[PDB]
Design a binder for this molecule. Sequence first.
Ligand SMILES: Nc1ncnc2c1ncn2[C@@H]1O[C@H](COP(=O)(O)OP(=O)(O)O)[C@@H](O)[C@H]1O
Ligand SMILES: Nc1ncnc2c1ncn2[C@@H]1O[C@H](COP(=O)(O)OP(=O)(O)O)[C@@H](O)[C@H]1O
Ligand SMILES: CC[N+](CC)(CC)CC
Ligand SMILES: NCCC[C@H](N)C(=O)O
Ligand SMILES: [Cl-]
Ligand SMILES: [Cl-]
Ligand SMILES: [Cl-]
Ligand SMILES: [Cl-]
Ligand SMILES: [Cl-]
Ligand SMILES: [Cl-]
Ligand SMILES: [Cl-]
Ligand SMILES: [K+]
Ligand SMILES: [K+]
Ligand SMILES: [K+]
Ligand SMILES: [K+]
Ligand SMILES: [K+]
Ligand SMILES: [K+]
Ligand SMILES: [K+]
Ligand SMILES: [K+]
Ligand SMILES: [Mn+2]
Ligand SMILES: [Mn+2]
Ligand SMILES: [Mn+2]
Lengths: 379, 1058
Amino acid sequence: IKSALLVLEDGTQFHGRAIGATGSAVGEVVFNTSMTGYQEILTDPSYSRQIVTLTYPHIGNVGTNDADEESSQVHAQGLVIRDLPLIASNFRNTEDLSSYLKRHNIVAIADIDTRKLTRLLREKGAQNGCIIAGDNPDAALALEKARAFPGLNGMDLAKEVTTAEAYSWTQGSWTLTGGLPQAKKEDELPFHVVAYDFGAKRNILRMLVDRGCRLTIVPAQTSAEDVLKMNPDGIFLSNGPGDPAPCDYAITAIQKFLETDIPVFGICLGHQLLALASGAKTVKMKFGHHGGNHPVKDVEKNVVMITAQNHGFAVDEATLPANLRVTHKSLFDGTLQGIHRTDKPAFSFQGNPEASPGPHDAAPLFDHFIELIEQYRKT
Amino acid sequence: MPKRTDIKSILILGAGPIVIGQACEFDYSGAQACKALREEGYRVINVNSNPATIMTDPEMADATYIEPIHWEVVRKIIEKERPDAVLPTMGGQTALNCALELERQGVLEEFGVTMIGATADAIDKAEDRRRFDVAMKKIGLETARSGIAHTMEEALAVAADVGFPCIIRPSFTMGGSGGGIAYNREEFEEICARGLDLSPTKELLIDESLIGWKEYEMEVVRDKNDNCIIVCSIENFDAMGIHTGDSITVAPAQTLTDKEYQIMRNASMAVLREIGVETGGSNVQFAVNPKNGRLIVIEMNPRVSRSSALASKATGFPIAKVAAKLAVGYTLDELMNDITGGRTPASFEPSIDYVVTKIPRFNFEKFAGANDRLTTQMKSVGEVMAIGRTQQESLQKALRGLEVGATGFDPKVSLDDPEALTKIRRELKDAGADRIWYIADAFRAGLSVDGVFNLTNIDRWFLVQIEELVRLEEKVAEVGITGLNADFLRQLKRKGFADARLAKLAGVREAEIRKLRDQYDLHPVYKRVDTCAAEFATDTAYMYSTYEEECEANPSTDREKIMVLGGGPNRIGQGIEFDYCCVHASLALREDGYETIMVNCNPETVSTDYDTSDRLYFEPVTLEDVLEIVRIEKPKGVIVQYGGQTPLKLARALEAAGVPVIGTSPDAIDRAEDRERFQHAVERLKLKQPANATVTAIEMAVEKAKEIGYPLVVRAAMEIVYDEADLRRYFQTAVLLDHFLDDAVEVDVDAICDGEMVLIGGIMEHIEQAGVHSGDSACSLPAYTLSQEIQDVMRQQVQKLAFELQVRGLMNVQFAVKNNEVYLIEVNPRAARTVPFVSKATGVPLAKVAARVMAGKSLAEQGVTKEVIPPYYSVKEVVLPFNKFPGVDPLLGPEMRSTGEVMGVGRTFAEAFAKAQLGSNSTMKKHGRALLSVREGDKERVVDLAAKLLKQGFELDATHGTAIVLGEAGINPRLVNKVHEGRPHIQDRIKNGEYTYIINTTSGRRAIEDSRVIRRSALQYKVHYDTTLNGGFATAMALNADATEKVISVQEMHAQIK
Ligand SMILES: Nc1ncnc2c1ncn2[C@@H]1O[C@H](COP(=O)(O)OP(=O)(O)O)[C@@H](O)[C@H]1O
Ligand SMILES: Nc1ncnc2c1ncn2[C@@H]1O[C@H](COP(=O)(O)OP(=O)(O)O)[C@@H](O)[C@H]1O
Ligand SMILES: CC[N+](CC)(CC)CC
Ligand SMILES: NCCC[C@H](N)C(=O)O
Ligand SMILES: [Cl-]
Ligand SMILES: [Cl-]
Ligand SMILES: [Cl-]
Ligand SMILES: [Cl-]
Ligand SMILES: [Cl-]
Ligand SMILES: [Cl-]
Ligand SMILES: [Cl-]
Ligand SMILES: [K+]
Ligand SMILES: [K+]
Ligand SMILES: [K+]
Ligand SMILES: [K+]
Ligand SMILES: [K+]
Ligand SMILES: [K+]
Ligand SMILES: [K+]
Ligand SMILES: [K+]
Ligand SMILES: [Mn+2]
Ligand SMILES: [Mn+2]
Ligand SMILES: [Mn+2]
């Protein structure tokens, strides 16, 4: 009996079993509907300071493997599941999930009614919480920490997970057959895109590479000037944790790029920043979107795509400056999912075209970027 | 985008009679489609020969045709109703096959009928195995190494190339029909000849073995804008080599990485795109090498299926309904998601927060000589489904819901059996219907997870869960009832252990575990199905039980509720017919103002469609599960009379526990169900029953037998013993004793009693005499030979029985008429399987009526007081699964083996019978050579049959004594040799196609055993055959009719009723 307990800001308690590291974890508690891809979710920087609840009951069936890592580490503050399986059963498995969590020092609880949890979050909106896994978990203590959490609203977390120094990436996507491929030689990549590291998934990077890009990842805080100084064929605004609003640096830099003709493409946090830099406004959603079965329609093409989502903030359609045209919307709630600068070659998508985990449906957004890129090059 | 305008009327092709491989799932689908189209404003026409379906109920559609599903017949419907389009994707292989013939025959062209949902070409592309393979290669998907064959010679050469074992898959078949796994040449020829024959296109695809790889399926929906979604994923428990229909399967998939899942999801879509399904759903099946993720495309089904029904039940996303709408022009994004209170659109991929398990229902015990091993050809007769928060909870619940008497992992072999490991090993290595039980037995006998894996190929992820459950059971057995503390019991409940399983282990009664839970306040909670893992709210009360925290039941305090108990999975003798009545109880009572609560777990049915009732509890129909529901619902009444045997058996227990059971009392039921109790009431009533006797000892029988008089109906699997020696011979091999009523007409009478009066629903004369189970008998309404006089005696007796036994609602009475005397065979104080047919035949919805009676509205108050005799004849004919089990002797008898039925409507009996016969897929011709080989009793009347056949143009063949009889009467048949007599014999002649009709009757175990070759050949060779003289005469009469001549709608039928 290795107890664990989760408490939400509202006082709700869920008692279950510790399945990862001993300790405590505090963050905003969110639910994710993905039936597969827990590893990828766990390792997505966007999950920084968030407690991840997975609605699919059996989490861990296939164990874990290095290829399934979205970053160098597990960003999730903690993990909430209904059942950890007895065994992992998959040829790609290199380590069982409990071992993995422990190894990454993650506080995780199993055996709780995740449904009740999801229902509460849906109904009453997101809540901050705390998990204590240990000998005799203090429920009063957990509540206090939950209540003492500052919250993600107005919290800049991009600066917190960004790389320290700029780096070069030239590695493409995995294949069943060849796994993760060797990094390409710079000369084999026609384009050179400069990527803003706001807590980037490796998959974004790999998919850009697959399309002919060679990249330079730069810290969140890079200046426009240093950026422009590189003479990129395009600029990329990665996905990333927290409130996009506070990232004044990014916004400024961005505004800076928009004065030029360099194609700019943002994904998720990148989508919100572009929007902000364009004069739009962002909002914190009631509970946001985390799942991999989310329908988004390309309104310009009247077509639906099933996509991967992982965001708690959104761009207000209503405050859209005139130079921003709406390109996609959520079919589940009508929220804004895509925009394109009417006057500039800058566009972004709220969802995650790179998926990992999730449907490959939105991959094509990447192609528009290349398109833009090549066009800028024609010039 | 929106609904198509150039189409006003749609003809929907139904699936026909229920058979192994093509069952209720098509009534559910067909109904959903009528539903969706009618809602959309289209004029709906449909054809379905099976009367036991909700889809053929008159108020469900505009022009309903209960007629043989033959192109020529369908041709007449088209001509007559002139539909603008035809939807052929909701009726199984039967509908696909028919659509294509109509196309081929040029009928569509002829009347300008546009094929919607799926095109003819698309269907063929997926249905023609060769076409399918070429297409996969075209899209870079991998398939098993194979070869197409159109003849035995070509077939051998493929085998010569892929080697044994190989998989044989006919084109244009489904459910493994006409296929199998060949381990050797002998079997290869056998399977090969079978499918080339059965293949509508005389084509087989022969593949190399992938036995043991993992098996998966995906349910896809695609609309005209090219929007495409995965509705559900399914991982099979049993590996490749065992048909999905005969496998335990679960949703969603469990052991694939997201990476692997995406590749399969992408391939699924590519497949639909390639085959060309642009406006509906399809199922794509795959094989995955657990060792390296290698993906192999196995097949695709361009239509709704048994998996798509399961998937709808599993996710709450109504596939068939959606598909129907897409067929007329709508796009996914335009449609609303049903259960999310139409808040989200249908264009999304469902996400579930639970585990769904399906276990197939078999009935090998009714097919003695059958090969009872699982293979690529389905053998199951039904399926149960369970929803649990965990795989263990899901599985166990399914196990107790299967109606095979299991309480969960009940043991098959003893711990102390020296040979058990050997037996265990065999059952694992070569899967039978009992595999799952044996798996647990294996863990109790000492084998490791790895050893089990090795024998079975079942993924370790499942095996470990079952092992864990065994270890828990060993603990219960050790600790006993004393160790059943609150924490442990709750643990146990969470893993889905049943009170009954726990009770056996702890050596106490189920009720004791039940009280214990009460004491500790350990009851399940109810979660709702909602398609989105709680991401959005729901207003549909589609629920399942689980041992969790928060309850979502939220029952009304507002309404008077009536609960209807389903029958669980379908099995032989407990089919769709029981479900039709459940559905009707629900529709009528709801219509009337009650809050209706349905309890059932058959994923194939309409009863488990969340639209059928106010509240649906998708649960095992067991005492435990029911009481939990009643506990929280506090209903006004519960109906246990419509689900068949299943709920019938819970009646007393339910009442004991204080459940408010409505209609005929549990005591009453017992009075009728208990032979002894029954025999006294008959006596009391001064009625006539055949002489009987309960014999214990052999020598006690032999005497008593002398008393009763032979022949005798030995009923512990029944038997008809002819002589003393026969008797012994029986016991040996082998108690009640009943004098067998030789040469008597059997009749069934369905009726309703409201305590004040009796309403005769129908008097049905069977064609086949008493001794041939009523479920396997063709029958006629109205009687075709019984005097009104003797029918009056039956009506009176029905009446006396009804009042005496205190029936309240439906009843069924079976008699035997002999020498102008009525003998009672039995009384069934509930809805019988004849109910739907009688209802269709007479226009009176007896299950709705009887349900109103149960709830308190009298016959008089409802205005249903006079027996209805229709102006046309309705004839019911059955379909037997013998072709699925070649080793079985395709002979009729006292025990029921049929899976379904059809109905024939005609001006005369000959006409009804001919429709019934054609509808039942009979291969009978109007010309040719007929083979006559009859028993002594039959020797007299055979003469007349022989002349009728002569008068019709047939030539005749006859074996020895039959020839003698015919000779003496002036008929000289061509003599034919018995197998023993010399060559050429019957077998050879049948094998050669010399016959188009066979009449073979027999009497006496031994006599039966010898003649086995005839029926066996006849069936194998597709020659129509009768095994009763009554049936032969009926067949002779139909020769005078023309089933395709005239068609009539149910509405028209009912309008003729005065
Ligand atoms: N190469 C193969 N090796 C082993 N089993 C196979 C192979 N191909 C198919 N099967 C098995 O046979 C079953 C029936 O084949 P399928 O193509 O689905 O035909 P059907 O259309 O009759 O359902 C599958 O569900 C699978 O278990
Ligand atoms: N005494 C009998 N004489 C002739 N046939 C009988 C007799 N008893 C039963 N049968 C045959 O056995 C069948 C089944 O017997 P029944 O008592 O109705 O069994 P079940 O409960 O299986 O429906 C009947 O439908 C009938 O054809
Ligand atoms: C599947 C049912 N049949 C093939 C389509 C054979 C009984 C109907 C003809
Ligand atoms: N109603 C039973 C089906 C009849 C079958 N042809 C036979 O007589 O054996
Ligand atoms: Cl909990
Ligand atoms: Cl046909
Ligand atoms: Cl078929
Ligand atoms: Cl391989
Ligand atoms: Cl304990
Ligand atoms: Cl019945
Ligand atoms: Cl067989
Ligand atoms: K718990
Ligand atoms: K037309
Ligand atoms: K097929
Ligand atoms: K191949
Ligand atoms: K299988
Ligand atoms: K299937
Ligand atoms: K009969
Ligand atoms: K009975
Ligand atoms: Mn098929
Ligand atoms: Mn199949
Ligand atoms: Mn009976």
